[PDB]
């Protein structure tokens, strides 16, 4: 929504350039759990899960817990939602398990932010 917006707004300043002031938890929460809703609802299913620890785990993309599972940190699913990184360009900080997670690149970013 307009909110999802303004959570990413919020951390964006950080995202640019990590020497600026680091959000609170709260703010690194709603901006985590919000743009992964986000995906989620424009690529409904539960073919992968998103698990972006300590914050949320999602399911989505068509087809108990799903077989494919992308798992990464806040802040590099921040820069992978806002398009300020590449899933291909990620390397060992996205852990990758299944025949289909890499499906997730076809719907990124979610949000997209001023480079």
């Known amino acids: 929504?307009?909110?999802?917006?303004?959570?990413?707004?919020?951390?964006?300043?950080?995202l640019?350039?990590?020497?600026?002031?680091s959000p609170a938890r709260?703010?690194?929460?709603?901006?985590?759990?919000?743009?992964?809703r986000t995906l989620a609802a424009v690529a409904p299913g539960a073919?992968?899960?998103?698990?972006v620890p300590p914050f949320v785990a999602v399911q989505c993309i068509s087809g108990g817990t799903p077989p494919n599972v992308v798992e990464t940190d806040a802040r590099t699913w921040l820069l992978l939602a806002t398009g300020l990184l590449d899933?291909?360009?990620?390397?060992?900080?996205?852990?990758?398990?299944g025949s289909r997670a890499a499906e997730v690149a076809h719907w990124l970013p979610v949000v997209r932010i001023d480079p």
Do not use: C, H
């Open 26 to 36: 709260a703010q690194l929460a709603e901006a985590v759990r919000l743009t992964a």
């Open 47 to 51: 073919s992968v899960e998103v698990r």
């Open 16 to 21: 640019r350039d990590p020497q600026r002031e």
């Open 87 to 97: 899933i291909a360009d990620a390397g060992a900080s996205v852990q990758m398990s």
């Open 1 to 14: 929504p307009a909110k999802t917006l303004e959570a990413v707004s919020a951390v964006a300043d950080w």
